[PDB]
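Handout for the seminar on molecular recognition.
Each group receives one record of this type.
Step one: identify the two inputs.
Step two: read the structure output and locate the region that could contact RJ4.
Step three: write two sentences on what you found, then compare them with the reference statements printed after the record.
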Amino acid sequence: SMQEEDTFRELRIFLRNVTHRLAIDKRFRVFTKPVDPDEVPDYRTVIKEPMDLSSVISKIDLHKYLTVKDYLRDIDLICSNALEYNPDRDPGDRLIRHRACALRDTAYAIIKEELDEDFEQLCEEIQESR
Ligand SMILES: O=CN1C[C@H]2C[C@H]3O[C@@]2(Cc2[nH]cnc23)C1
Ligand SMILES: O=CN1C[C@H]2C[C@H]3O[C@@]2(Cc2[nH]cnc23)C1
């Protein structure tokens, strides 16, 4: 229905606004673009599904997310990719892990404060009907 398409348009507006607030935070610069093959040719052999905040905005615009849950699976994949690729005790690895955990926790905290639980349940019920 037209009302259902208006629901999904509101979901996309919400997700673009959360993603922009993450992307401008200086702590999260390392997560704003895909990893360059030139800097890590090793990256794509270890990490089987790369993800970054630029790719997330492209996916919002392609209508890939019909619920906040499916958006948070990609935020969680940005974080888990960084924890798995950079697991060592040295300071460079510990700094990117701390920033990855902060990206995840910040996204969840904005959603907790600003998403209406009844809006998310409506998106889930439209998705399940298709
Ligand atoms: O050597 C400098 N770089 C290679 C990468 C290693 C580490 O920082 C990256 C980008 C990225 N993403 C996850 N972990 C890293 C840029
Ligand atoms: O279910 C979760 N809630 C937390 C709030 C955030 C968001 O939805 C609210 C109420 C409200 N008013 C404006 N924006 C919202 C209820």
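Reference statements: The helical segments are 2-23, 43-46, 53-61, 68-85, 91-114, 117-129. The chain has six helices and no strands.
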